C-alpha cells in the first residue's frame, strides 16, 4: 500500500542530506559578519542618509 | 457662577479637539458629534453677549435665538441618524445631505422672525417644539427596540438583572431631558448644560478613553 | 524538532485498565493546548480528551467521561490518560496531538489525516 | 510491521547521525563572534509615505526591481499597482476571485501574478498592445489555496501552495515543468536566492527546505521552530536565511554549516510574526507580528534595533527596495506604509 | 518633461472614480462562509435557494448577497480560515441525526468560536435534517444516552415552541441538540458575536428569510455597539 511505502522515500532523501559538506560554525558565522561590514556604507536604512539624497523625502 | 461658565465652554472645545485632530475618531457619527458639541458650546456663547449688551441691542437678539434652534435641531438629527441605523440603514450622500438640515434650516425661520420684527414668539417657539416632540417619538422607538434586543441576546441564557443595568444606562444617555426643560419652562440650568453633556458623551465615552491611552503609548 | 512519543497501551481484558504515557520534546510543553485522539479500524481520526495550558480545562469527549481521565505534567513534559474501564469499542490508535499555536484556546486540526503535531500513535487493544 | 519497523529505525538512525555532525561543526556561537563589534544602537524609521484606496484587508505585496513601484493584494478582488515617489496608482487590476492571498511583480516589470484559494497564479500582463492590463494565462494544477508564487524569469514562475507541494511553471505553456514535493504540512512562504539557482520555502510543519531549481530534489531540511513557519527570506549574499514562525521567533538558519546560527525572540512578544525581511547590508532584519508592529532586530547581536508602530490592525506583509532605499508594510486595515 | 506628470496624475483620478464606484457596490453586499461537513448537508441549502472556492450570490428584498464555499481545500483548514476574518456571518450547518458526528461539529464550532481572528464573526446555526433526527427518535434505535451522558439528566426548556404535532421525546432530544452548541457560544465572547440556530430540513422552502434577518440583526447589533448601547 501507500502508507507502509511513504517511509520508502523517506530514507532516501535523508541519505542525500548525511553525506554534505558542512564548514564549521565560526568561520560561517565570520562570512555573514564580513559581508555586513563591508557593505554597511550602502545601507540607507541602517545610515539614514542625507534628505537631498532621499527620494520620499 | 463665572466659573461655571468657563467649564461649559472650556470641555466642549477639548472634546471637538478630541475628535478632530485624530484620524481613528472618524466616521459619519464622529462627524455628527462634532457639530452637536459645537452648538453647544455655541448656545453658551450667545447667552452671555445677549445679557451683556441687555443688562449685564437686536444684533445678539437674532443670534441667540438662531443657536437656540440651532442645539435642540442637533439633538433631534443625532436622534435621527442612530434611528436610521437600527432601521433604514440596512442597505445604506447621507452624511452631507442633512448637514444643511442642521444649520441652514433653523436659520431660515429665525429670518422670518425678524422679517415681521422689521415693522409693527410663535414663529420661533413652536417649530423648536415641533423638534422636541419628534425626537421623543424616536427616543421611544430606540429604547423599545434596545429592550427587545437585550431580552433576546441569546434567548434565556443570560441574565434578566444584567441586561437591567444594561437597559437602564442606554437609557439615560438618550432621554432628552434638555427639551423638557425648554416646554417647561417656555439660572444655573445653563451654567452645566455645556459642561455636562462633555463628561458622558465625549469623557466618558469608553473609546475615546482606549484611544488616548493609544495615543500616549504611541508617543510615549 | 517537534517530537511526540507515546508510551503504554497493549492488551488488556474488557473492565481492565491501562494507562497512556506521551513524551513531549521538541517545545515548551506548558505553552501549548495537549489533545488525545483515536482512530478505530475502519474509522476516522476521533477527538478524546484536551487539557489547557494550566491543566484547568479538562474536558472530555463524553463516550469516555467516567472512565477516562487526563493529566498533565509540565515540569516532566509529559502528558498522561489514565483508563480505568476499558470496552471493546475502545480499541483504537491513541496519539497525541498537540494544539498549532502556543497561546490560544482554540485547536485546530488535531484530527485531520496529515496533522504535523500529532505522534505515531500506540496500539490499544480490548478482547476477550 | 516486522519490516516497517526496521523502516522506521533507519530513519530514526540515519536522523541521529546528521546531528552529531552538525554538532561537531558547532564550535563557536553567532553571539560570541559578533560580540566585540559595537551595536548599531537605535533605529527610527518614520512613516514617508502612506497608501490608501485598497477597500479590504491588504494580505500580500511585492516591491518592483526600480524600487519604485510596488504590486498590493487585498482580499477585495484588487490589485492595485502603486507608484512610491508620487503616492500616484498606476493600475487597478479587478480579479476573479476576491480571496487573493499573495501577489509577485516580474523582475522586468511587464507581468504581475496573483493568487488564492482560486488555486491559480494568475498572471497578468502590464505593457499590452493596447495600454491595458488583461489576465494573460491562468496557472491551474494546484489541489491546495496558492500562498506564494514568485517570478523566477519572464517566462518562469515558483510557487507554493497550501497542498504541500511547490512546483516550477513554464508560462508559455502553462504546465509545471517541475513539481517540488516533500513537505507535510502546507506551504505557507517561498524565497528565491539572488543567483535563482535555488530557493527556500517554510510549511505549517515547523521545518524548511532548500530546493534545486533545475533538479528538483530537497538539498537539505532545516528544523528548529516549534510551530507553523509564516514567512522566509534569503540573506543578501544568499548563504543564509531567516524564517519567521507563530512560536514569535525569528531565527537565522546558514546553508552552508547546515545549522540555525541565531534566534531573535523576547519574552514580551508572545504573537505569531507574518513577515521577515533583511535590508540591503544584511545587518538589520525586519519582522511583521501579530501585535500590530514591525520589530527591527540586529542580525548579529539579536537585539530589538527598532520599532515601526503605525498601523491598526496585524501587519499581514512585509519588503525592502533591491537598492535598500525603503521598506513598506501592508496590514489587514487596508493602509500601505511607506517607512525610512 | 511635465507631460509625463500630468498624465500620471490624470491616470489616478480614473482609477480612484472606478474605487469609489466598486466601493458602494462592495459595502452593500453581504459575504457569508459556509461551513459543514460531508454529511452535514450543505449542498442541499446551496440548491434550494434560488434566490477551489464556490459562489452562491441571492438576492433578497433587495439586498445582495454573497455565500462561499470553500472545498477545493484539504482537511487542514487553520490557515485559510484567517481570510474570512470580516465577512458578516459564518452559516454553520450541522447534521442533526447524526449522533456520532455531533462531537466533531461541536469541536470545530468552538474552534471557530474562540479563534483569535474570528472572535468577532456571529454564526448562523443551521441544524439541518431534522425529519431524520425525528425517525431516529421515535425509531428508538440510537440514544443520545450513549454518546451524551448529560442527556439523562435534561429538562426541555420551558421557551421551547414546537411545531404544530411533535413527540415530547423528540423536542426534548432537538432541543438538546440545540443547547450543546449555545452552550460553547454564551462561555466566551460577552457582547462581541452572537449564534443564530434554527431548526431546518431538506424541505424548508425558504431558509433564507432566516439568513436575511440575522444578518439584519447582526449588522443592527453592530452598529448599537459602536454606541455602546447594547
Ligand atoms: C446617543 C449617543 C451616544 C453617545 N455615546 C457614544 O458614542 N459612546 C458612548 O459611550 C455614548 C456616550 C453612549 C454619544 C452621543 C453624543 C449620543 C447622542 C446624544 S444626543 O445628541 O442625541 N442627545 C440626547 C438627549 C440629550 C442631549 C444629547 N441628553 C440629555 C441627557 C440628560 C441627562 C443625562 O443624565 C442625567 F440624567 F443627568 F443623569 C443624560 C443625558 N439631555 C438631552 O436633551
Same mark, same amino acid.
Request: net charge positive; glycine share 6%.
Given at each position: ?57 | ?220 | ?36 485522539? #483515536? ?27 467516567? #472512565?477516562?481521565?487526563?493529566? #498533565? ?56 | ?15 541521529? +547521525? ?34 490608501? =484606496? ?48 499573495? %501577489?509577485?511583480?516580474?523582475?522586468? =516589470?511587464?507581468?504581475?501574478? %496573483? =493568487? ?14 493596447? =495600454?491595458?492590463?488583461? $489576465? ?38 502553462? +504546465? ?10 502546507? $506551504? ?31 538539498? +537539505? ?11 522566509? %527570506? ?15 521567533? %525569528? ?7 547546515? +545549522? ?15 513577515? $521577515? ?64 | ?86 465577512? !458578516? ?66 429538562? !426541555? ?74
Amino acid at each position: 500500500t501507500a502508507s507502509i511505502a511513504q517511509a520508502r522515500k523517506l530514507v532516501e532523501q535523508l541519505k542525500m542530506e548525511a553525506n554534505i559538506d558542512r564548514i564549521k560554525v565560526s568561520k560561517a558565522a565570520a562570512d555573514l559578519m564580513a559581508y555586513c561590514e563591508a557593505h554597511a556604507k550602502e545601507d540607507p536604512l541602517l545610515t539614514p542618509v542625507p534628505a537631498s539624497e532621499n527620494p520620499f523625502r | 457662577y463665572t466659573v461655571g461658565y468657563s467649564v461649559s465652554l472650556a470641555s466642549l472645545t477639548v472634546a471637538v479637539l478630541i475628535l478632530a485632530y485624530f484620524r481613528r475618531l472618524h466616521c459619519t457619527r464622529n462627524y455628527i458629534h462634532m457639530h452637536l458639541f459645537l452648538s453647544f458650546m455655541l448656545r453658551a456663547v450667545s447667552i452671555f453677549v445677549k445679557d451683556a449688551v441687555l443688562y449685564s441691542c437686536r444684533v445678539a437678539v437674532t443670534f441667540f435665538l438662531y443657536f437656540l434652534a440651532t442645539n435642540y435641531y442637533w439633538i433631534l438629527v443625532e436622534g435621527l441618524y442612530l434611528h436610521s441605523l437600527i432601521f433604514m440603514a440596512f442597505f445604506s450622500k447621507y452624511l452631507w445631505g442633512f448637514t444643511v438640515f442642521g444649520w441652514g434650516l433653523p436659520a431660515v425661520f429665525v429670518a422670518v422672525w425678524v422679517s415681521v420684527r422689521a415693522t409693527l414668539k410663535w414663529i420661533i417657539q413652536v417649530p423648536i417644539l415641533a423638534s422636541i416632540v419628534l425626537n421623543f417619538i424616536l427616543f421611544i422607538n430606540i429604547v423599545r427596540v434596545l429592550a427587545t434586543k437585550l431580552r433576546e441576546t441569546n434567548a434565556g441564557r443570560c441574565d434578566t438583572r444584567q441586561q437591567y443595568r444594561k437597559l437602564l444606562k442606554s437609557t439615560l444617555v438618550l432621554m432628552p431631558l434638555f427639551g423638557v426643560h425648554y416646554i417647561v419652562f417656555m439660572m444655573l440650568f445653563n451654567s452645566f448644560q455645556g459642561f455636562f453633556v462633555a463628561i458622558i458623551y465625549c469623557f466618558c465615552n469608553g473609546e475615546v478613553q482606549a484611544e488616548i491611552k493609544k495615543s500616549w503609548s504611541r508617543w510615549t | 524538532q517537534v517530537q511526540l512519543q507515546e508510551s503504554g497501551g497493549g492488551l488488556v481484558q474488557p473492565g481492565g485498565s491501562l494507562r497512556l504515557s506521551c513524551a513531549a520534546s521538541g517545545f515548551t510543553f506548558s505553552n501549548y493546548k495537549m489533545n488525545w485522539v #483515536r482512530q478505530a479500524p475502519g474509522k476516522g481520526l476521533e477527538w478524546v480528551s484536551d487539557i489547557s495550558q494550566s491543566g484547568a480545562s479538562i474536558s472530555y469527549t463524553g463516550s469516555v467521561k467516567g #472512565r477516562f481521565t487526563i493529566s #498533565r505534567d509540565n515540569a516532566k513534559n509529559t502528558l498522561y490518560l489514565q483508563m480505568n474501564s476499558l470496552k471493546p469499542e475502545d480499541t483504537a490508535v491513541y496519539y497525541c496531538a498537540r494544539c498549532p499555536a502556543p497561546f490560544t484556546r482554540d485547536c485546530f486540526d488535531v484530527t485531520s489525516t496529515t496533522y504535523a503535531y500529532r505522534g505515531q500513535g500506540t496500539q490499544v487493544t480490548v478482547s476477550s | 510491521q516486522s519490516e516497517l519497523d526496521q523502516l522506521r529505525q533507519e530513519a530514526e538512525q540515519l536522523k541521529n +547521525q546528521i546531528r552529531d555532525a552538525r554538532k561537531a561543526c558547532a564550535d563557536a556561537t553567532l553571539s560570541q563572534i559578533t560580540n566585540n563589534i559595537d551595536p548599531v544602537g537605535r533605529i527610527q524609521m518614520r512613516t514617508r509615505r502612506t497608501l490608501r =484606496g485598497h477597500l479590504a484587508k491588504i494580505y500580500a505585496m511585492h516591491w518592483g526591481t526600480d524600487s519604485r513601484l510596488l504590486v498590493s493584494a487585498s482580499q477585495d478582488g484588487k490589485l492595485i499597482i502603486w507608484d512610491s515617489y508620487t503616492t500616484n496608482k498606476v493600475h487597478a487590476i479587478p480579479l476573479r476571485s476576491s480571496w487573493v492571498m499573495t %501577489c509577485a511583480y516580474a523582475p522586468s =516589470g511587464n507581468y504581475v501574478a %496573483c =493568487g488564492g484559494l482560486d488555486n491559480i497564479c494568475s498572471i497578468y500582463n502590464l505593457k499590452t498592445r493596447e =495600454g491595458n492590463v488583461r $489576465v494573460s494565462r491562468e496557472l491551474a494544477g494546484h489541489t491546495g489555496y496558492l500562498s506564494c508564487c514568485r517570478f523566477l524569469d519572464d517566462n518562469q514562475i515558483v510557487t507554493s501552495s497550501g497542498d504541500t507541494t511547490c512546483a516550477l511553471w513554464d508560462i508559455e505553456t502553462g +504546465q509545471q515543468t517541475t513539481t517540488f514535493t516533500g513537505h507535510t504540512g502546507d $506551504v505557507m512562504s517561498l524565497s528565491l536566492a539572488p543567483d535563482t539557482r535555488l530557493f527556500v520555502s517554510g510549511a505549517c510543519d515547523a521545518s524548511a527546505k532548500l530546493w534545486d531549481v533545475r533538479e528538483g530534489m530537497c538539498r +537539505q531540511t532545516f528544523t528548529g521552530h516549534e510551530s507553523d513557519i509564516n514567512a522566509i %527570506c534569503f540573506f543578501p549574499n544568499g548563504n543564509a536565511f531567516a524564517t519567521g514562525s507563530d512560536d514569535a521567533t %525569528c531565527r537565522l538558519f546558514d546553508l552552508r554549516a547546515d +545549522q540555525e546560527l541565531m534566534t531573535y525572540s523576547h519574552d514580551n512578544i508572545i504573537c505569531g510574526i507574518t513577515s $521577515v525581511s533583511f535590508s540591503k547590508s544584511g545587518r538589520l532584519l525586519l519582522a511583521g507580528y501579530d501585535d500590530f508592529n514591525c520589530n527591527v532586530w540586529d542580525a548579529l547581536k539579536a537585539d530589538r534595533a527598532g520599532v515601526l508602530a503605525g498601523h491598526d490592525n496585524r501587519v499581514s506583509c512585509l519588503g525592502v527596495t533591491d537598492d535598500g532605499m525603503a521598506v513598506a508594510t501592508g496590514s489587514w486595515d487596508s493602509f500601505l506604509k511607506i517607512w525610512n | 518633461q511635465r507631460n509625463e506628470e500630468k498624465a500620471q496624475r490624470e491616470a489616478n483620478k480614473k482609477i480612484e472614480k472606478q474605487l469609489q464606484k466598486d466601493k458602494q457596490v462592495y459595502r452593500a453586499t453581504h459575504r457569508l462562509l459556509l461551513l459543514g461537513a460531508d454529511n452535514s448537508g450543505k449542498s442541499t441549502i446551496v440548491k434550494q435557494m434560488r434566490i477551489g472556492i464556490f459562489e452562491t450570490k441571492f438576492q433578497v428584498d433587495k439586498v445582495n448577497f454573497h455565500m462561499f464555499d470553500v472545498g477545493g481545500q484539504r482537511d487542514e483548514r487553520r490557515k485559510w480560515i484567517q481570510c474570512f476574518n470580516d465577512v !458578516t456571518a459564518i452559516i454553520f450547518v450541522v447534521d442533526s441525526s447524526d449522533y456520532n458526528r455531533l462531537q466533531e461539529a461541536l469541536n470545530l464550532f468552538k474552534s471557530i468560536w474562540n479563534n483569535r481572528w474570528l472572535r468577532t464573526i456571529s454564526v448562523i446555526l443551521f441544524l439541518n435534517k431534522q425529519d431524520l433526527l425525528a425517525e431516529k427518535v421515535l425509531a428508538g434505535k440510537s440514544k443520545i444516552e450513549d454518546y451524551f451522558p448529560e442527556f439523562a439528566r435534561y429538562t !426541555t426548556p420551558e421557551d421551547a415552541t414546537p411545531e404544530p404535532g411533535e413527540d415530547p421525546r423528540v423536542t426534548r432530544a432537538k432541543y438538546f441538540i440545540r443547547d450543546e452548541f449555545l452552550r460553547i457560544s454564551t462561555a466566551s465572547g460577552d457582547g462581541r458575536h452572537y449564534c443564530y440556530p434554527h431548526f431546518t430540513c431538506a424541505v424548508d422552502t425558504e431558509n433564507a428569510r432566516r439568513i436575511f434577518n440575522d444578518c439584519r440583526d447582526i449588522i443592527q447589533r453592530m452598529h448599537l455597539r459602536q454606541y455602546e448601547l447594547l
